[PDB]
Curated annotation (Swiss-Prot), chain B:
It comes from the Bacteria. It comes from Thermus thermophilus (strain ATCC 27634 / DSM 579 / HB8). It catalyses: ATP + H2O + 4 H(+)(in) = ADP + phosphate + 5 H(+)(out). Keywords: ATP synthesis, ATP-binding, Hydrogen ion transport, Ion transport, Nucleotide-binding, Translocase, Transport. This is V-type ATP synthase alpha chain. Its EC number is 7.1.2.2. It holds the Pfam family ATP-synt_ab_N. NCBIfam families: PRK04192.1 (NF003220). One of its GO terms (molecular function) is ATP binding. The keyword S-adenosyl-L-methionine does not apply. PROSITE patterns: ATPASE_ALPHA_BETA. Produces ATP from ADP in the presence of a proton gradient across the membrane. The V-type alpha chain is a catalytic subunit. GO terms for cellular component: proton-transporting ATP synthase complex. The lineage of its organism: Bacteria, Thermotogati, Deinococcota, Deinococci, Thermales.
Swiss-Prot record, chain C:
It comes from Thermus thermophilus (strain ATCC 27634 / DSM 579 / HB8). InterPro entries: ATP-synt_VA_C (IPR055190), ATPase_a/bsu_AS (IPR020003), ATPase_F1/V1/A1_a/bsu_N (IPR004100), ATPase_F1/V1/A1_a/bsu_nucl-bd (IPR000194), P-loop_NTPase (IPR027417), V-ATPase_su_B/beta (IPR022879). GO terms for molecular function: ATP binding; proton-transporting ATP synthase activity, rotational mechanism. The gene is atpB. Pfam families: ATP-synt_ab, ATP-synt_ab_N, ATP-synt_VA_C. This is V-type ATP synthase beta chain. Keywords: ATP synthesis, Hydrogen ion transport, Ion transport, Transport. One of its GO terms (biological process) is proton motive force-driven plasma membrane ATP synthesis.
From Swiss-Prot, chain D:
This is V-type ATP synthase subunit D. Produces ATP from ADP in the presence of a proton gradient across the membrane. It comes from Thermus thermophilus (strain ATCC 27634 / DSM 579 / HB8). Belongs to the V-ATPase D subunit family. The chain holds residues 169 to 211 of 223 of the full protein. It comes from the Bacteria.
From Swiss-Prot, chain E:
This is V-type ATP synthase subunit E. Belongs to the V-ATPase E subunit family. The keyword Cell membrane does not apply. Produces ATP from ADP in the presence of a proton gradient across the membrane. GO terms for cellular component: proton-transporting two-sector ATPase complex, catalytic domain. One of its GO terms (molecular function) is ATP binding. It comes from the Bacteria. Transmembrane segments: none annotated. Keywords: ATP synthesis, Hydrogen ion transport, Ion transport, Transport.
């Protein structure tokens, strides 16, 4: 009857572990994808000059 | 298309100018007759060309010509089921045009251009071609032989010759954008096919042999090695190997082995029959042989051959089973070549590369994933054999380093009779670890716990017997006898099987599992008897043991049930006393 | 750019190229096969009569009509960023994974350059490494360059896996801020197999340790020359981060057998007469520079530490492979094998163990006052065991004193009790803690090598 | 046994090392013969 | 049961540590995902800027500037050879070229674009000057300088 409790203990630990890894990943993963996108967009704005530079050194 | 003239002739080496624009390492017919050769140190408008066969009889003025092609393997359907030499020459077209010997100056092809295969071009023109892509099948002994594009080609398809008969040589479909494509395409031995992801080992490998998998698995894609003095039954295994397998394509190819025994392979091979379809065994097979005497640089290539060809088949999605033996002799050729090239030796006498080419022979394998997106098995099991007679000469201790599992076979244990005679105490396989997940999935779930448990048995006999056995089994105490009595059983059943019994010479996990299970389970209760001091040498005569005694002989259909009755009886023989 | 055509004689080794006057020494060249395949090499030997280039992979299919050599870099040189970490990084630096190039930062030399003696202090801090035995008796002082000597059967890898994760710096024992030493390790897998490769993968990813490492890989079935690079590449990486950015860096080579192994294959195609027993006699020089570029630097904060891991071709400590390391590096821990037969894991052993240092990173104000003491005790304890264990076997089992029966059982305790430590960890405290338990059995009238105060401070 | 064993190896490796140098030395002799007679081609 | 009291304490203990630290590796997993995500992001960026560079540099011959730009790169290489003999550029370039079509060491021949080739000092060398080879380096060069410049 002590075995029943201990097995049951595993449950609370496992479900809660499960649920926590299952939720944390969800929010984070789709937030990472979003931030990656949002740094593209930061770049987007001003991006030309580098090419201009590269062209300029080789150009003569 | 590049033609030269002979200049000097120093035995195997020949030198001939009239050749620049040559390419490093190629075929080349040389002689008025012409014989295959090989470019090594080129210079200016000459190269040194090594014409493998007995050069004798060549004069000067004979033209020289190159194919501008490295030594390659020819890979297409129809290759299977036959016998060939190092540079892939099928003996039957030989036998007819030589009588006895093999004469020099014979040219053939791997695949006879005389057979018209009928097929299906499994796609449609108007498509995208990609390397490694699919193309079309014929069947040859019940095979889905997927004739695939050689990799590194791509573009548009136009016009697709439909089904129907074509001999091999005839092309299939074509690209608009130039270049057709034939059925088969050649591959250089040296590179290895590009593949897309090695994948971790974690996949079992069956062989059915008790001792094989339960104790010393290798995993599929595993890589082992086996020594074994001869005159001691080592071929047995090699036979059984292919017999059950777990793969479905057998390639066996060693090279050089004192005459007669190399012929034994040849003869017993057709007699054995698949025990999975009842179809003749030779059907799903491919053998390359090469006998001592055979030309030097033949032999050097030999392995590599086998290696490539294995990859081919592998590439088609099957699971394969290469075997090779006489690796110990393999180095031989290598010495020889390095004799005739003046490069110092090193170590004992085998040049240095023997920690590399030896290496690469093994790397290429594991759990490849095709470009065709499927899975294909390339385990190699490393025969070696020194009648140098040691576990220390270079060759062996090199393999040992790279590959992972060592299945020592030894004569001594064998002399008492008990075949296979894989001597357990000296064998090992680093492998087990990563197999554990799949292990526990499929068999039982207490499964590991058994293997480790039972091994201890013998262990605790080894160092007991060792000493104390020079008193027999009667000056021992209680449990002392008990160990070796059980030991007996591990050795009279769990060990020794046979390869001459339809009833047993094959297993499955789930079968062995019960076997072993019972043997702990009778033993722990054996100890409860002696722990109360019961008659000992009585336990040793109870009818229960005979139900073990027959256990191997239990057939696989009856196997479940045979545990079923038997097992619970064990529970009851101790209640009796 | 410029660029030489005039390839004129080949052999399995190097090959011939006429006219050079601007291809200096040690130049890294690539050669376009003209069939759209490119390969490379070094420039050893140069003259007013012709340059020759070190074929890197294989000759296979070259001509003498077209093809060309091409000067790629003039000094072997390469970038190192602190973007690095996490990237799974094959030698030559075009890494694995799917992730794109590494952005350079500082492109620097790859031979290293000697570190003039007046620039490095004697070391004096202590690395807490998880294997007790090592940190008990011996000492992995942060400077050091201890080497682990292995064989077939003894696992070399697993051991090295161990000190992988269990490694920490414990600042407080001395008594300072943690922040000061940010932590990382090189680790270069040089010479792995199928299985061996597939092993270390997870060892990082499981404990998340991939976050403070870079994995050089080698596969051991790529052209020979790549191997004779991957150490020296791997080092410099750390050097940047080591001195310039300050970290405490572990550097973990694997089986230098596979080093020599490869290294010689040069020499048998260059010919310097390897008068030595299977290896080029200019050996030592090279193994010099590889085991010598790590340590502390005065007037800087971070430091390096090398871990060589290598197996002798037989037991005999006299095939030069393990031997020369002996001279070169300091210290020496070995594994034994007789421990292995009995099963205690992970067998290390102590009877030939040592550490050249272990006189710093000791005692008060640093460590704890008792390493320095209990060091020798155990040493001296174990010794008198083994003597005894001879004499059972050649005279009697009660033809012994009983002044022995305690050292017997002390040898067992020190045996399977202590040495074994499972794949659980330990900690330097916990170590010494149970180190005291180790002593306990012995009467206190025999323990000459210990200051009186501690004797009652523990038991 | 494990000692006098231990001697025997020692013989082996040294008996062997003897001849590495043998060849290497001998090699060089060839080099001379050919280099030398390459200019007994003359011209 | 008396026994039961002694278990129930302990199974909270062992699991509690294996819980938070277990969560750490999950939380750290997200961090590994954040790092990777970012690392993907830098590759598109650097590649894109590369692509445009290719396009502009490839638009160098079509653009109204092209015979003018020619003789620079022609000169730069020509300078590198201390002897001379050849100078090959397509039937695009070559007609336009009047400078060293007039001068040289005389003779211009054949044809294979984004660069100019030539030979000098016998046929031995082949020294050329690809615009793309200056690119392949320089791209590698101001790598990082560009990313700072960009995200800046």
């Amino acid at each position: 009857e002590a075995e029943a409790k201990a097995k049951a203990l595993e449950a609370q630990y496992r479900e809660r572990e499960r649920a926590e890894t299952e939720a944390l990943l969800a929010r984070y993963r789709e937030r990472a994808e979003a931030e990656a996108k949002a740094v593209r967009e930061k770049a987007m704005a001003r991006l030309d000059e580098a090419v201009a530079l590269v062209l300029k050194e080789v150009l003569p | 298309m590049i033609q030269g003239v002979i200049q000097k002739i120093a035995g195997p080496a020949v030198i001939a100018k009239g050749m620049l624009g040559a390419r490093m390492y190629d075929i080349c017919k040389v002689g008025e007759e012409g014989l295959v050769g090989e470019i090594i140190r080129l210079d200016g408008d000459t190269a040194f060309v090594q014409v493998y066969e007995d050069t004798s009889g060549l004069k000067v003025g004979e033209p020289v010509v190159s194919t501008g092609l490295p030594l390659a393997v020819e890979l297409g359907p129809g290759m299977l089921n036959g016998i060939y030499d190092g540079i892939q020459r099928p003996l039957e077209r030989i036998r007819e045009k030589t009588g006895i010997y093999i004469t020099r100056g014979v040219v053939v092809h791997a695949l006879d251009r005389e057979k018209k295969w009928a097929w299906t071009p499994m796609v449609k023109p108007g498509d995208e071609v990609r390397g490694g892509m699919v193309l079309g099948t014929v069947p040859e002994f019940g095979f889905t032989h997927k004739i695939l594009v050689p990799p590194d080609v791509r573009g548009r398809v136009k016009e697709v010759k439909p089904a129907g008969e074509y001999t091999v040589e005839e092309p299939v479909v074509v690209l608009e954008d130039g270049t057709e494509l034939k059925m088969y395409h050649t591959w250089p031995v040296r590179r290895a096919r590009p593949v897309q992801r090695k994948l971790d080992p974690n996949t079992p490998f069956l062989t059915g042999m008790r001792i094989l998998d339960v104790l010393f698995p290798v995993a599929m894609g595993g890589t082992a090695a086996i020594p074994g003095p001869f005159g001691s039954g080592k071929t047995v295994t090699q036979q059984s190997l292919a017999k059950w397998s777990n793969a479905d394509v057998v390639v066996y190819v060693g090279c050089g082995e004192r005459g007669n025994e190399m012929t034994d392979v040849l003869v017993e091979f057709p007699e054995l029959t698949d025990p999975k379809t009842g179809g003749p065994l030779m059907h799903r097979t491919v053998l390359i042989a090469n006998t001592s005497n055979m030309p030097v640089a033949a032999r050097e290539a030999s392995i590599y051959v086998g290696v490539t060809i294995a990859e081919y088949f592998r590439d088609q999605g099957f699971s394969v089973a290469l075997m090779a033996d006489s690796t110990s002799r393999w180095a031989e050729a290598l010495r020889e070549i390095s004799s005739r090239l003046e490069e110092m030796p090193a170590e004992e006498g085998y040049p240095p590369y023997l920690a590399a080419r030896l290496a690469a022979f093994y790397e290429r394998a594991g759990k490849v994933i095709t470009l065709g997106g499927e899975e294909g098995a390339v385990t190699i099991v490393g025969a070696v054999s020194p009648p140098g007679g040691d576990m220390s000469e270079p060759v062996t201790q090199s393999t040992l380093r790279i590959v992972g599992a060592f299945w020592r076979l030894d004569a001594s244990l064998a002399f008492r009779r008990h075949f296979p005679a894989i001597n357990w105490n000296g064998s090992y396989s680093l492998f087990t670890s990563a197999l554990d997940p799949w292990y526990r999935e499929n068999v039982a779930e207490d499964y590991p716990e058994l293997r480790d448990a039972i091994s201890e048995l013998l262990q605790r006999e080894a160092g007991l017997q060792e000493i104390v056995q020079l008193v027999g089994p009667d000056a021992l105490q209680d449990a002392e006898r008990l160990v070796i009595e059980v030991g007996r059983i591990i050795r009279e059943d769990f060990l020794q099987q046979n390869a001459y019994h339809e009833v047993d010479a094959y297993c499955s996990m789930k079968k062995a599992y019960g076997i072993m299970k019972m043997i702990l389970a009778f033993y722990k209760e054996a100890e409860a008897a002696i722990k109360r001091g019961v008659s000992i040498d009585e336990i040793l005569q109870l009818p229960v043991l005979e139900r073990i005694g027959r256990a191997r002989y239990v057939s696989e259909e009856e196997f479940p049930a045979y545990f079923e009755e038997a097992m619970k009886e064990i529970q009851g023989a101790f209640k009796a006393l | 750019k410029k660029e030489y055509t005039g390839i004129t004689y080949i052999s399995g080794p190097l090959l011939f190229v006429e006219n050079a006057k601007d291809l200096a020494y040690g130049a890294i060249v690539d050669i376009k096969d003209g069939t759209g395949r490119v390969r490379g090499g070094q420039v050893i030997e140069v003259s007013e009569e012709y340059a020759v280039i070190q074929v890197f992979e294989e000759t296979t299919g070259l001509d003498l009509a077209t093809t060309s050599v091409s000067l790629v870099e003039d000094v072997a040189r390469l970038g190192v960023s602190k973007e690095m970490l996490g990237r799974r990084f094959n030698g030559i630096g075009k890494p694995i994974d799917g992730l794109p190039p590494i952005t350079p930062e500082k492109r620097l030399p790859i031979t290293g350059l000697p570190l003039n003696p007046v620039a490095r202090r004697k070391p004096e801090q202590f690395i807490q490494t998880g294997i007790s035995t090592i940190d008990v008796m011996n000492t992995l002082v942060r400077g050091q360059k201890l080497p682990i000597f292995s064989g077939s059967g003894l696992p070399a890898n697993e051991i090295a896996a161990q000190i992988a994760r269990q490694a920490t710096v414990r600042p407080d024992l001395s008594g300072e801020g943690e922040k000061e030493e940010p932590f990382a390790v090189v680790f270069a897998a040089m010479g792995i197999t199928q299985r061996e490769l597939s092993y270390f993968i997870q060892e990082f990813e499981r404990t998340g340790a991939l976050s403070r490492s870079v994995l050089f890989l080698n596969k051991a079935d790529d052209p020979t020359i790549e191997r004779i690079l991957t150490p020296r590449m791997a080092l410099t990486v750390a050097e940047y981060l080591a001195f310039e950015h300050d970290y405490h860096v572990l550097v973990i080579l694997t089986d230098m057998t596979n080093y020599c192994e490869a290294l010689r294959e040069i020499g048998a195609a260059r010919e310097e007469i390897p008068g030595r027993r299977g290896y080029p006699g200019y050996m030592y020089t090279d193994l010099a520079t590889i085991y010598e570029r790590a340590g502390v630097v005065e007037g800087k904060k971070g430091s390096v530490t090398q871990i060589p891991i290598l197996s002798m071709p037989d037991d005999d400590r006299t095939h030069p492979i393990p031997d020369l390391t002996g001279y070169i590096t300091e210290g020496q821990i070995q594994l034994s094998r007789e421990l292995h037969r009995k099963g205690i894991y992970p067998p290390i052993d102590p009877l030939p163990s040592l550490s050249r240092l272990m006189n710093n990173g000791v005692g008060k104000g640093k460590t704890r006052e008792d390493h320095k003491q209990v060091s020798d005790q155990l040493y001296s304890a174990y010794a008198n065991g083994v003597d005894i264990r001879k004499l059972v076997a050649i005279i009697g089992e009660d033809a012994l004193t009983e002044n022995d029966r305690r050292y017997l059982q002390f040898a067992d305790a020190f045996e399977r009790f202590f040495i074994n430590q499972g794949q659980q960890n330990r900690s330097i405290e916990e170590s010494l803690q149970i180190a005291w338990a180790l002593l306990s059995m012995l009467p206190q009238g025999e323990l000459k090598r210990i200051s009186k105060d501690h004797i009652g401070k523990y038991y | 046994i494990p000692g006098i064993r231990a001697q025997i190896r020692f013989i082996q490796q040294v008996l062997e090392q003897r001849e590495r140098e043998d060849t290497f030395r001998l090699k060089r002799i060839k080099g001379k013969i050919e280099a030398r007679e390459a200019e007994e081609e003359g011209g | 049961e008396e026994k039961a009291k002694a278990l129930l304490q302990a199974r909270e203990r062992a699991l509690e540590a294996q819980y938070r630290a277990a969560l750490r590796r999950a939380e750290s997993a997200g961090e590994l995902l954040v790092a990777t995500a970012r690392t993907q992001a830098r590759g598109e960026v650097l590649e894109e800027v590369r692509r445009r560079v290719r396009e502009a540099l490839e638009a160098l011959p079509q653009k109204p500037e092209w015979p003018e730009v020619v003789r620079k790169l022609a000169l730069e290489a020509l300078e590198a050879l201390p002897g001379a003999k050849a100078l090959v550029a397509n039937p695009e370039d070559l007609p336009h070229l009047e400078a060293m079509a007039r001068e040289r060491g005389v003779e211009l021949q054949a044809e294979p674009r984004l660069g100019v080739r030539a030979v000098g000092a016998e046929g031995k060398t082949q020294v050329e000057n690809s615009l793309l080879a200056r690119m392949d380096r320089a791209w590698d060069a101001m790598s990082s300088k560009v990313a700072q410049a960009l995200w800046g």
